[PDB]
RNA sequence: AGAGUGUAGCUUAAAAGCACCCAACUUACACUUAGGAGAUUCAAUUGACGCUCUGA
């Protein structure tokens, strides 16, 4: 006795004839991306997971990259990998810019919203 | 409706002088030969150079240079033959030597009533008539010659419809081997072009997009 | 016969005297990753201009071959068809000097 | 484009030195064969 | 389990394929198994070349099911690589010709000879 | 004190942890995280971001995974989270960069070796 | 002249990810590691600069 999937089966639409002409996983960490992206998605089966869970700036930062990696002496020290990048400038930078979504990052996960607000 | 059948060649001339080298190209010939004699290991003309004279000079203090020079000499005596028939003459396009690094295209002016065009060697086919067999008739009827050829397939390369009663032109892809070309200075209009003449030969969408299956390399 | 000339001579063992020494300097092999760094370039360029001009003969040769199907439905079958002479198939590499 | 499979090296490691000797079988086509002993010029009789 | 739903997630043999005349019967018409003879006095050019070929190959999806070569003649010495092609189209067959004619560095010899 | 996902022991990665730094090495640019075993992210540390991507030759080599990982061992000193686990596969555990990754989280402050949970 | 239009080769990606190339192991391929180049066609959702198709 069988009964019919109820959702899509994975691995349905490669199944095909001719598998010999089809360009090919030559590695392993291909498939580790790609089954983590499917692991990630939800299905329709039980999972772990169910019972366990503006162009000037860009105009600016172009410029920036063009006119870094022109110097000389920046890309003799990146090939002899002797380049060293100064900390303080990167953390004040990330102050500025993406520093509120991290923050979040961390009210979220260190147990803050769920009991100040619900 | 009437389909005036049509078919052509294009006549592909091999390479028999390699291309010239880029200076950059140069430079990593210099770069791989000097990588090269660094990753070698004891050749035995360099044990019977240094060596022998180390022992000469033993000797002395108690032949590489004669064949390095007669091999200069030699290299001096034959003289290689010119890669460069092509800026002297600069004028025989009819001639199979125009040029010598790059492919070479049969090209004939056609005399018509309504038109007078520069076009890629053409025929009139047949149904019963095979297209490779259409081709073969092309080359040895319309050039007057003796060439022996070599064709790939039976597959074409790029057909183009013009009409003024339908018409079609059916263009092929041939490969000299070598020919008997005797009476070079034909009473046609054969020119050899590599790539850009054909440009300023052959102007209209139905010859200036002749060179999209030409191999430019 | 599984006879195959990949092995190594025997000569090439005592003798390893003669080049013991690799030394170069810094804007020498600084020349060597920029020329590293244009060779990657200009060979990736030049398959460019390969892959362009093999995608532009592919869709003239299918273009060619579906306008050759709908003008002639007689000619397909045999425009498809091989040629046996393909067997003896040779062809020598360039020279630089003419005979 | 037939300079793309001539930018060459030895891919193995025991090796001597190859130098390039123009080379002609009968014909007057001089080729640049990597050979031992340095010669500049070659003639097959 | 074979009566619920998900039977046969994990199966995978029908992934696996872990196992010569022309395949020329009406329309597709396809070249068997071939052998492409590179002739060369330098090593260097003949597996250099050998390496461009097998890196078209693989790039265009052609099956080769070995990349031998075969031992060298006293005479000079002659240097002699294999490259075995299967599965063309014959106008791929008429590309990968003109391809393999017009990438001859140096005085290279081609055959499109098949197998026996 | 708290549970550890112990099992897994056929499949790669072993859950049994706390904080996982995660390295994701692209055609164009390396990426950090510093993640639950529930799959919650926590810190994060991206190249895919101006402040570390200006100061940076190019975002894939040695020095950007070095800078990287002193930019996400100074975010982690800060953030509380002091031990983390580093699963590497052989072929690029063995690789320069990952070395030299693993060297400055070490010079950072941030023991990559988490302690035994107490039973 | 009209229509379809438009991010490097590809994207129901929003300046990303797969592609691509050399350097090293491999006869060779492939893996891996070291490196590399990359783009939202120009002006205020709209117009015009580039390509394809349909006409003469």
Redesign the interface.
Known sequence: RRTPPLGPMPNSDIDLSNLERLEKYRSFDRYRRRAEQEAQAPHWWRTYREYFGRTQQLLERKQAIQELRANVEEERAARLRTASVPLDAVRAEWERTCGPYHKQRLAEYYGLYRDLFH | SP?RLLGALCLQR??????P??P??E???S???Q?????????????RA?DENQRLAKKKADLAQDL?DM??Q??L??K????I?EADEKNDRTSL?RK?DR?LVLLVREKFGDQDVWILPQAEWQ?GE???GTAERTLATLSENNMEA??????????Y?FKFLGA?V??F?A?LLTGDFSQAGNKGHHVWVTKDELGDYLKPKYLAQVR??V??? | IPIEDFITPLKFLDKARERPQVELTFEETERRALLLKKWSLYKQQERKMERDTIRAMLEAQQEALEELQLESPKLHAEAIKRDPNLFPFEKEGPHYTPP | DSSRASLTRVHRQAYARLYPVLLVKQDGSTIHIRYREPRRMLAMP | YKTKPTHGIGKYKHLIKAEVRAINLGTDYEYGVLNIHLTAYDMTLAESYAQYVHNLCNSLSIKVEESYAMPTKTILTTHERVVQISGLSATFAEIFLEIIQSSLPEGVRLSVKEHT | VARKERGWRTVFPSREFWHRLRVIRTQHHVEALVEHQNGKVVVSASTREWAIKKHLYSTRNVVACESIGRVLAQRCLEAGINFMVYQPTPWEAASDSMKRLQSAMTEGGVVLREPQRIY
């Open positions: 389909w091999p390479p028999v002088v390699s291309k080298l880029t950059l190209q430079e990593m010939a770069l791989l030969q990588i090269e004699i660094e990753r070698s290991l004891y050749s035995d003309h360099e044990l240094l390095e091999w200069e030699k290299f005596q034959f290689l033959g010119a890669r028939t030597n010598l492919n149904p095979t297209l490779r070599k064709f790939l397939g039976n597959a074409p390369c790029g057909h419809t079609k059916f263009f892809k490969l999209r299956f191999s430019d390399l």
